[model samples]
Target: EVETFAFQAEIAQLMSLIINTFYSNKEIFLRELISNSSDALDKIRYESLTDPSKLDSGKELHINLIPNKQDRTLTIVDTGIGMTKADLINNLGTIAKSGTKAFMEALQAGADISMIGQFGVGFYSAYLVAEKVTVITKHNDDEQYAWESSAGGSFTVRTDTGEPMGRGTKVILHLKEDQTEYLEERRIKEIVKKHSQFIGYPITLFVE
Candidate 1:
């Protein structure tokens, strides 16, 4: 049941605003993404408390960053609740919850928005510095799936036959030409410490 879908008109415009207008503080993109991973990890951990089989018993909840300067890519991996085909479409294809309209309105009104919360659109902020974004994820109830897009108002999802991720999500950002600074280990470390140190999970930078 995999298919490609177009983002809603408003969603496309929202992505455009983030990609074209939001450029001064590109480092915050990592902060938003890491914060999202933390939230996902927290969700699975909380679910596991009530349902012991929610995730692998004693699964180590952590986040990993793999930067490939040669390939000009940065991958952020997390052990958390992954998404299904439907989840990918619903979550990534459109803004589906309350507060998002207000959030966008605030952004349009020149309000100083701080952090992106669980409203779902935060994931699209990856486009601020990435020309292409790929998400490889596996959920306990569904097969591994890959969702990819270039923030061009549409995305495609398909079954992934690659190595299983156990239960989590992996986001690979194909960095834009002028955004190579994110590939530097020092820059990533500084951003993590400054913005994501308070995250309730271990953030590891996997160096080659």
Candidate 2:
């Protein structure tokens, strides 16, 4: 089954503010994305300690970064607790149950604090540099699925028929015309070191 959702009026405004107002600080988007990926990994790690079967039998915990210059795409792949269809709808579709407004207000109020990404709005920061974002994820209890949006008012989710990810999420950022610098290995490495060097999990950059 396929599902589509329109962002609420208020959320559309909040997204607009994030993409437009923070364009100058777009490099931080990678930091926010990797932070979220680490958090997801942490969740499943804790859960698996209690019940090892919570994890897919052979998958190891790690985050992989793949930058394709030819296609202007940057991919973040994590072996973590992937979301279910409902999870995707609730988390990304609804902006953490309308928490974005509060986060946006905090930013406007000059709360330039660290860990702001904890509020979930950090995921939307991808729009600062991406023309479109696509997430392919698989939860142990669910089939692989794809969630995509152009940072417009709406996003769509559909069953994925491609090769399975086994378990976890893969986010692909389609870089905007002028944001191609994000496709450079050195640039990504610099950003990761600046913002996420203290992350608990290993973040590996894949090069071909």
Candidate 3:
């Protein structure tokens, strides 16, 4: 069995970068999240190129963003290669192992935005505007797991039946009062252009 490991001290620093100072475009959360979805679908497509069976039964590879204005919740789901338990622990808990060191160094040097955009650390940015974040991921190699965090040092992991999407991950954010401005289509579209307009993916925003 693969043992779990927490991030080294450097990983925490990387978290601060992503959670605190990564994106000046707070509204870009929609774009960044949707870009993540596109990347996920890309992963499946690449895998299926050689192994056709790898494709999901759904055959639709797209990113979706849904907002519940009443509940003040936003859900972003993607059809991508889901993470295993080890991946969950490392990707979410630790930062250094995921090329975060290089990413941080680039950020410090005022690196090119295009290069920095390739890094996947932006997912943590969800906490910048959410009181709580829920992640439900279904991986073929491991059982589904739920990861919950609130920008707090602590997080929880539990088993999940993995309803909703057949494959990929879904992130639900309970928007904070200040971030409620994201519930607008114009805001989301503009933010998408600012940070991810040229991204190698298609991003869609929910107006309802």
lDDT for model 3 comes to: 0.68
Predicted candidate 3 versus true structure: per-residue lDDT over 28-119, tens digit per residue: 55655676667677877888899887674557676767878898988887778777777777765234355666776786888743353366
Model 2: per-residue Cα lDDT over 28-146, one tens digit each? 88888898788889989988998888875445999999999888899999988889998887755335545766776677777752334766667877888898999998888888899
Superposed Cα deviation of residue 201, candidate 3 (Å): 5.2
Runs in model 2 lying further than 4 Å from the true structure:
93-95, 112-118
The TM-score of candidate 3 is 0.78
Using lDDT as the yardstick, the better of models 1 and 3 is 1
Q: Where in model 3 is the C-alpha error above 4 Å?
A: 1-7, 17-24, 92-95, 110-119, 162-164, 197-202
Error of model 1, residue 116, in angstroms = 3.8
TM-scores, all models, native as reference: 0.91, 0.91, 0.78
Candidate-wise lDDT, in order = 0.81, 0.81, 0.68
Residue-level lDDT of model 1, residues 5-49, one tens digit each, is 897676677677777774586677888889778878888988998
Estimate candidate 2's alpha-carbon lDDT, on a 0 to 1 scale. 0.81
lDDT of 2 at 84: 92
For candidate 2, the per-residue lDDT at 112 reads: 57
